[PDB]
């Protein structure tokens, strides 16, 4: 049975994983894939937090929202640069570094 209801993962790539030959070790391959998934989800959640603070900036600031939330707009648009897994239809001006 599970001990407590809060997730315990490690924020470090699994050892004995060779980038040159990632398919040599199956366990290392699968753990590295899981770690990459976790990192991508962390980036996605960071972008979501930036988006939430941007929307609340736009709500709090009224007509003068173009200059008060400009920094938040730029931050969100640079944060959504490499979020996706298969978002290749998005233009490189907004989805490529």
């Amino acid at each position: 049975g599970r001990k407590k209801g809060y997730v315990e993962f490690d924020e470090s790539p699994p050892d004995d994983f060779d980038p040159a030959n990632p398919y040599k070790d199956p366990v290392a391959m699968l753990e590295m894939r899981e770690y990459i998934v976790r990192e991508k989800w962390i980036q996605i959640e960071k972008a979501k937090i930036i988006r939430e603070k941007l929307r609340w900036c736009y709500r709090i600031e009224g007509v003068n929202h173009l200059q008060k939330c400009r920094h938040l707009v730029n931050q969100y648009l640079e944060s959504t640069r490499g979020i996706g897994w298969g978002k290749d239809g998005r233009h490189p001006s907004l989805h490529a570094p």
Binding site: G1, R2, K3, K4, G5, E8, P26, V27, L30
Partner: protein, 85 residues
């Protein structure tokens, strides 16, 4: 307290993540070892290397060495000499 009991029961259910990961690693390693073993098992040819040297396959030699003195297959000079001595 009903919700607390339900949460405790659910936690008593499910599986320990540490044990799940350990079992997963052990199973994957075992499968990899056994599959390379089965591949090397299949790699062997049907005809063995030493089959011409095997005692079971070289069964005529012993019998014919045993039976070489039978008159039906004797060398004539051997019979001549055994008659002479």
């Amino acid at each position: 307290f009903i919700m607390e009991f339900a949460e405790n029961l659910v936690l008593k259910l499910m599986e320990d993540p540490k044990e799940r990961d350990r079992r997963f690693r052990e199973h994957v390693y075992r499968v990899k070892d056994r599959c390379e073993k089965t591949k090397e098992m299949w790699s062997y040819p049907m005809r063995p290397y030493g089959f011409w040297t095997f005692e079971r396959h070289n069964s005529q030699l012993a019998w014919d060495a045993q039976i070489s003195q039978v008159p039906g297959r004797r060398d004539p000079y051997d019979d001549l000499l055994q008659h002479y001595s």
